[PDB]
């Protein structure tokens, strides 16, 4: 025999890829004669900023190919050996590569809307060749790797405006944004967002949708009865193809009058019109006052009512409310809460604590420990 | 194993097929791959003793008893498995004999309405009531059924309709009605609450005194026990005062067990001093709003018996003489009379108050006093 | 040589036949040349011992003792050979008097039903239960069985009435029954389930299990791509229960890239096991109530899926397990745990508190520390 030491490899190549994200590297080369194998021992180290090394992996194969899987982006150096059956290590070779990626978006801002949400993201420094890729989600995803799968891919711009019928107010939505450009893709920056919440801020929105439809441009905005004094109490069902060449439907009762040189109308209409992506139903009732009742044993008082923007309910169990304003009624409100935060009360019992930044009383009475860690001042004392 | 208990037993009294019949229905907690049920119906003797009448062993969830005469009865069910392990029993006492005379009567006024409710000298849950309304006193009971208003037949009857106005003393003549028959009539002397307003009592009042009100109520046509009627129409007419009256309604009525049943939907504008005033009035026992996107089926808005359910909602200002969170102990709650109730409250500012009732205090800095201090055990 | 004790000694008491009795049953152990059962029944006297009552010798594995009185008893059985050498004894112990009425009663309030499940301290396997429901707590107890709807007699009840509607209390009168007697009565209180989203899937229960659902939803009428059908139909017709079912509806369906979109509302009045029920189903992707008053074009009530949006509103009570002012930092809130949030609390009255933590407090009158003052610094 001869324990001949294995002369080092040449034509050592590293190929960098990003198959499932989390970049890998495929190490490959060629060799002349081998004895009871002649192993290949590999080890791969990243140069830190200052020129010192992290150990990243090792590898004990026999063929002239290998792959390194969970990777971070860093300046990597891969060294390959050649040990023989006895275990006498040949001279090394080494190759160096990088994985340069765009800088993350440093802060992304998230102004609400009406059934919509804007992310406008910004980088720590200005970058001319950066454009961000946005993926939207409704549930905080576990880790910042499976976003490539479990989060819808919105699109890619300098910003995005997610509108739909499904971004619903007071349910937070997490935006996942990664910077992209010619050089690669960064990590995923996460952020939360909302919809505006503001109640009366939704009603104008709805008015706007309503108006731009079959029932808006039929039940109202219809210009018949051109003679003072009439009652064209009308009721039909029309379905037809549109300029988009899709079917649309409405069936209504339109009633309307002319008296004293002025017009009126009231209008129970039901439809389903097309949209770019699907069909939106709708059941729009315009009238000077709406109310319902349970007629049980002679009872005729409506269960609810509403008439030019004031709606009259007996008792409700709400899943959750959310008004900026509350009153006992009257003009000493027995209690109140206002858009500023003030909880106007009368007699305010609390089974728990009151972490208040301050007090402002007359007549106090503590039945156990009264601690003072500040500058206590007093006039007359008898205890 | 024993099959579980008997759930939802009932003690009812039918006379549909020409004579009296006692049905019951029983549903199973969890169903045990071959549940059987013994059920025992027995009578009370003149000495108040127990006599067996009918024992049925069946594997079905309902049964009927036919050719059953007058008297008081007791009905039990047990569950028996294949191996023969009779379970816990569930037993209800019922009666085939009735019409007692109502002992007291309860009267609650209201805006254009007045509640008459029965009180029977002994309770009996196999009974409903006929109500008759009179504007003039009827001395003899014979024309009480003939020369008055047929209010109807039900449980708790409130007087509220077009013929009812504040300030007149109305009368009630009511009796007990069942499968057996009806009793000696009883009277009461009662008055509507004129106008107390609530905040919808004005809207009821507005509603009653309208053409929709007259159409979709107090039209009591089609009165054939266990029959019914539908109409979808639009009757436009010119009124007394030389003006139009438009209207469109969908009205359904039925009659069953002597009692009158109805609902529907109206859209109308009448004539007021200014001119026309449009509408949509629904009356019914449950209304209910649905959104079928994705084939989701859960309402967002369900109202029955003057109450609402609603999922999430938003608002420009609540106006509300009381709130809770719900709970036998409600997590928080403002009272109409100004009291607040909470397990906690963390204010990021200043607590302007009159007084204090604090078992513990922990003031972190300066405490200015301009009055008198009284501290038992003092350190410093 | 010695025969063994009688095993599995089982006693059941009854007085149904006219007055009080005990059935004693057991299983014979293996003996020599025949066997006789000796039974000795004693009652616990005033002294804590047992006064001897009756003694019999028999030869059948079951026996009866008649015309005994009320008390806790020791019944001893022995196995005797032909020679008179009696085996080991087996003495059972079992109790008699008016059974003890539950110590408690627990209500898991279900969505539109109570589940009132009693319990005692010292458990007797051989007492049943009577249950009673009422809407009004009664002054006395002696007229409950004269003034209360009879739920009946089981181990636990679930109580239902169709009109049940959450979030009011209703009062309970339970008792233990057995062969001895109906116990003294017992009180309790309860309500129903409070949550709304629960009701709304509940009501979805009620919605879908109707011919309303079965026509509106559940039927997949139409097929080929770009299908659209609009129809107005009515029927009041015979069903299997010999009832008329009465329904007018509006319905639309459409097919776009295959997927099938329905919407449609309808008044109806179908039949229930108690009476005909008159119920609204509006369904659409979105319903708005909007007003025509003076070129009015803005809503006051927009229900888009699981949400509602509204304007200024007017309630009478509220039960809402969260209310927040909007904004990521809300002006105020109450999450369900009863924690309040705010920035001013001008309770112009007593803060009836359990803790305060007020960094820099002003007092301008009497401070009366019943506990421990504790001050780093004082300049008084």
Numbering used by the authors:
A (entry chain Z): 613 to 995
B (entry chain F), C (entry chain J): 616 to 995
From the paper:
Bacteriophage lambda’s tip protein, gpJ, plays a crucial role when attaching to the cell surface. The gpJ protein, comprised of 1132 residues, is located at the bottom end of the lambda phage tail, serving as a key component of the lambda baseplate. Genetic evidence has identified the E. coli receptor LamB (ecLamB) as the direct target interacting with gpJ during the phage’s attachment process.
These enabled the visualization of the tail tip opening and the deformation of the central tail fiber. Upon LamB binding, the bottom part of gpJ exhibits bending. From bottom side to top side, its cross-section progressively expands from narrow to wide (left). The AHS situated above the CSF experiences a dramatic orientation shift of approximately 180° (right) and enfolds back onto the CSF. The upper α-helix (residues 809–840) within the AHS remodels into a shorter α-helix segment, flanked by an extended two-layered β-sheet at the summit of the CSF. The C-terminus of helixes (841–861) in the AHS domains have transformed into two additional β-sheets at the top of the CSF (colored in deep blue). The loosen of AHS helix bundle leads to a reduction in the restraints on the FNIII trimer from the bottom side. Compare to the closed state structure, the distance from the FNIIIs to the remote end of the RBD markedly shrinks from 29.7 nm to 13.2 nm.
